[PDB]
């Protein structure tokens, strides 16, 4: 059974079907199966098979997200039984991401979020126009390895400094490595601001996130 | 004698370009009407939500969703004027914007960087807006000015946007289209235009020298700012360009038809909100909408898709009876090479042949991140060739010129002809494009368009005189800008 | 349930470009018939003059001027086929040329120089038979280059042998695609016939049915057919070789400053050539062709990258359609001396118009310096431009499926379409350029901050190095090679 | 290579049927505006008369005649939505009604009798509430029957309770498809609203957004709206219930013998109804409907299977399109007393015209005996006829792929296409009737030498026996059932 | 691949109606030196019979049946010379064609293919086949049954001459004749004294098997 | 008759290739209409393009 529940969880993701992703997460609950087992032996297995083809140039962005959407359709089905109740953690880094406050551009942030999710990391999307304070509150509440903000304007890119500050005066700036990315964001900005990582793109961000903690 | 009496004759003036039939246009309209009901539009601004609600739209206050009924689109359209005139300080630069095929060009906006030619890019600042204004003031094909690059230097030290309003009107006498205003600050712009006209609000309204753009948040929702720009725009009599910017595969369907349905709904909902706030309000059905590159994770704005969508939005606007403002002469190139020229031409020729009332993009590079002063005059040179091409092929007895063929006869040439002499200025004559044989070219530096262009930039920026605003008047406008920074620091 | 039954619906597939009304096309036609009677057309070839005379034309033997009556123009047009297939050495490269809007591209011809890479930068060196071989290989690779056209002259064979015959075997040997000879010689048309006959194992009936070779000729503007032009036409029609009757007038120079008048001139010239072809052999395969442009009165040069060239080519396509014939026009041409911003602009301007107009063959690809040079860098760039142009030509398909309302509603407000089944299935639909760079500054700078020309060049190097062209059977080749040698001997015997 | 780049191409998708020119539609419009002012329209309902008067109409209180000015007709047309969605109990049965040529079919209503075979002899028995239940099940199964329309009267409830309210729950309970009430009662519209409100758990906002119930009304021809008609319209607009304003005039009877004049009459009647709807509530969902036919002056009957009915329905669809409204017309109707050769003819005649014309809803399926009877046998037969009609409506698609030249050449002279990949992949494309017999005599005789009617009947038996309809939640049903009971009590209290 | 995989790729070539795939497998077979008889019997025929099933279950129709027979023919044309240079099974051979003066053939081609897929080795003589050729084929191939197709009552008559000339050559007594066609009935068969009447293709198959 | 007018005729296969100019020629020659007479003039029926 378990082997079959992991065979499905994988098929669910390589096939890009949210339903089956919920089905398996269901027959999974109806077996007492540890959800963390399903999120790794089961879903991330297929998650990583896609990224594999993504790397060879067989599948593209569409497939990454479509697969990430499935992994979430399943994880949703068991978020109650999971961490909420049992309170168990997954593995392979934890990155909190969202578009800086005052900014609603989200396409990019969502692509970075998926490329990470598919790389093997646990992504926590904070949404967009995320108020600076929420970044901080989510950092000490979730205690993630990486905190990422996205800014696509020169006027919302400036708010990334505030993430650095309010994080320092929260006594957690040293508890997590920050990352900055966006069309106007550059390495110089990352340095000048004091950000740990600079994401040139979704691939560069994934490569640097692991090279920074992996 | 010769005929001087022909009967009914049908002619085509210029070049007509068709993408749709009436059935198809309606196909897209009906689809937009279904979408305006579901999911509908999310209007963040509560002032905007009340106007909609006061007029029939069923507004859900929990979700901020507005379902605009089709009769409000109709009523809105019946109200929006079909034409209006943008004004510059110099009447000669005045520009009409009317439902049809009357094409005009304006520059790109807004870049964060400015190309300086080797070739390097350096984050823009208010001083840059001053030059481009000088350069664009000289560029004949650039009908009016559009905020080209953000003055990042005034960013955080004052009302960046209010500064971005004074410098353009200052260094240019042509209409000024603000590509990125702040709703909260529309009052200032009004006061600046009003200050120009010596405090005569009537003059400011009657002769708008300042217009403004706003973008729907793709997909399907107007932000508090977009709404405030519209609403305020309509109360103050400032022409508003409701220009959406969806992305195929990203914020809208991968298909171009579906992407027009989403683009349409956004724009109309904006235009509906303008006409409801103040009937007869001047608006533009605009678009910069394009296709999102699923294999490059980028938003190419020089693809043949942007060219099509722009040309398609132009036809839609005509369908609805409104002026169009669309993306054109754009490139994804990072340097002025073959690719820039190609994309600049592809994305400009389509909406031009289609009838776009305003085509913005000139000067662009790198998907809109940079503004090249070289590409800008190259672009302006490309528009001359476009206008030529747009003259199509006039067919009259005079132009068929049978007698000339007969006068010159077999084996001769038409050079010594009077007709050839008198029409010397008719054939295209590019200012920058090189048509010399290798020898003369090579004897001039073996220079390519880029350098020949940069040499021009330097010459224009050094010898061109812009008409300055009278000192009395300027101080009055500067004051307001100062009053604006005051407040910014205050808060 | 969901509708699946709609009444008559009017659709426009693609992009339609209009330049004339029927009344206007008629105007140009009447103006031409007028010109064909006065001043008429000077036919230098006595044999052609006889064929004209035998069919009803008034022929003045002292001036050699022929006055073609409209009924012969009409007769010829009823005889000329609306379509014919250009065969390649490889059947998959077959290209149909037919009255309508089916567009195809071919490289330009013929340059006398070739852009190269020496101690840096691209320079220009006079063309040689080997350059034809390289360019042929490149073109065999370019997918948007339907067939091959003599790109440059085999200057190194001039005075040593039959240049035009070398300019025939070399291309055929280096490309499995159809070959269009841009500079044939009336006297040697038999050699081309024989070379194609050899290729088909001496089966002349096969050579006629699967023409892998076609040729072009130019009326001498204004209003006159040279002896060589008449021979190419006459022999062509008799040997079953597709002929491209391509006028090359110049507004202000050899024709009126006005584009319409220039079309009348161009029209008379081409129609006379077509009339000759049909009178020689009814049903002879012919192209209504043009490379007519405008003479720059202010520069004393023949700009071929101007908007007038695009307009004239687009107009000629419309005229060809009007007369029921396949069109062959200039496009993707530039006056730029180097592959820069200008090349890109001109190439796109002169290609977009005739393409949107429906020209059946647009030649110009690879050109630079007003036709004097051939750039392989520019050739692959043009090939990429054609992919973009082909995309633009798909217009905006409007159907219930494309309108995609259910998708819009499914995605809802504030979300994206990246993960929809719809989006994935169509990942290959959007334009996907091979050379045009769409990366953001960072990735681009990391790849070396390369402009399009250097990127194109690296591609050329890669193609010339790794591309394989279906070779001709070694035995068959010997036979074909023999004819060339035979032609060379004769040349020396002169 | 193979072309894959074509210039603008003009196409006609499907089959276009024309009856008028703009000038002609204008003629009918002007003639109607004329009629609307003289003699005007008699509005019996005082409340409607007031709504008309309040908006600018001249109202004579003694004669009750209303003269509607053209600006109100224009105003009303600007207010009416070009489309709206009819929801089913099951979302998959949702049907869009919009200005255009998107065609849909629904059964007819309302017969007073029902066909039922009894010992070989054809037999019709007066209709009862149960018949509505059976017919509703059958229609739920018929795929070409987009939505359900009150087929027959619940005669057995007459005088015992609220017939029209029973005629509401029964259908809704036996079909997951949208229900169109063919015979609503102005006074009881609240009950319908409540029954639909109950279904949606008392959520009136939901009931308005997902209308599973709509209703029809008939102007009393010539030129007058009854009180019931006005109430259905007024209440309908106020409760957010789609209303079908369906005229029912007769050439030679209640309107001119000339079809055009009959259209003017029909046009005035319907427009006044539509004007009322929009003045009551701007944006009210309405149908421009018709069942207008010709009165047989020589038979003193109202033939509804005649070519005039098909023409009038087709014309009304064109008019609806002209005015920008969705159309609802009669089609697939017959005067035949039994499912014979005549039924087949008339049913196809009266359906083909309005379908090719673009009527958005064609009702008539299942009808016989000029509207007096409902035949389940005939209903499944009509459903099959619509599949054939839908096929005919695909017209002749013309593209490079459909022209299939490569297939023709591949197969060559004297061979067949049975084994081509092309043929297999499209095996499901050709028309494939469910009941129409296409076998040769032998196979047919072996199956029992059955005519279409008996075959249809066996199908009816099979469907009624094995088809499953998505039942309504038992609790929700109780609430809905309550309203019916409440309505019944009130009826007895009268 | 190993014989096991080649045999499967050969069945798939059929179930997918893919001539190019049938030819490639045939080459993988010949290359491996594998016996052609095992490639046909356990390979194509496996996939050929599978189609027949799906056809008998209304899941597939004529297009599929003829395509499958053709995908198989492609791959066997490849391994034909081989089978020749080594010598070589059908339920029995069937010779068919439309009779003289009759160029109808779509059906004859269908009956023929409906047999190839059943098992019988069908020998198609074509269309407009003169009576003599019919006889001069019974003596050469000696197939279990000689079938004819007439769609015209005018050519249906020639179906007699096939009898009155196979007895004329003492061969009638060997092969069972068969007639079929739109105008052909069971009676006409009994009259001219033919062995089997072909109602439809399916029927013809079922009836030819009746003579087991 | 086909060969005599310009068509390519392969005598071994008996295949004829008709050039478009002959299709055009034939169409210019064929009458757009003709009358089918009956034994009774009143039954005359016109067949014409339209």
Numbering used by the authors:
A (entry chain M): 3 to 216
B (entry chain A): 2 to 118, 122 to 495
C (entry chain F), D (entry chain E): 2 to 495
E (entry chain N): 2 to 89, 92 to 215
F (entry chain B): 52 to 101
List passages from the publication reporting this PDB structure:
The 22nd genetically encoded amino acid, pyrrolysine, plays a unique role in the key step in the growth of methanogens on mono-, di-, and tri-methylamines by activating the methyl group of these substrates for transfer to a corrinoid cofactor. A substrate:corrinoid methyltransferase catalyzes the demethylation of the specific methylamine, and subsequently transfers this methyl group onto an associated corrinoid protein. In summary, we have determined the structures of native MttB, and its complexes with a substrate analog, sulfite, and its physiological relevant corrinoid protein, MttC. These structures have provided new insights into the mechanism of activation of pyrrolysine that is distinct from the previously determined MtmB structure, and details of the key steps in the pyrrolysine-mediated transfer of methyl groups from methylamine substrates to the cobalamin cobalt in corrinoid proteins.
The 2.7 Å resolution structure of MttB-MttC complex was determined from crystals belonging to space group P21 with one full MttB hexamer bound to six MttC monomers with approximate D3 symmetry in the asymmetric unit. The electron density of the cofactor is consistent with 5-hydroxybenzimidazolyl cobamide, the predominant form of corrinoid extractable from Methanosarcina spp. grown on methanol. The cofactor is most likely in the pentacoordinate Co(II) state, as one nitrogen of His107 binds to the cobalt. In the native state, the helical cap domain blocks the β-face of the corrinoid, but upon methyltransferase binding, the cap domain is shifted to expose the corrinoid cofactor so that it can participate in the methyltransferase reaction. A similar positioning of the cap domain away from the corrinoid cofactor is observed in the MttB-MttC complex. This positioning exposes the β-face of the corrinoid cofactor and allows it to bind to the cavity formed by the TIM-barrel of MttB, thereby placing it directly over the pyrrolysine amino acid. The interface between the cap domain along with loops of core domain of MttC and dimerization loop of MttB provide the primary interactions that stabilize the MttB-MttC complex. Several MttB residues appear to undergo a conformational change upon formation of the MttB-MttC complex. The most notable of these is Met249, which adopts a conformation that moves its side chain away from the pocket in a fashion that appears suitable for facilitating TMA binding to pyrrolysine and its subsequent positioning near the corrinoid cobalt.
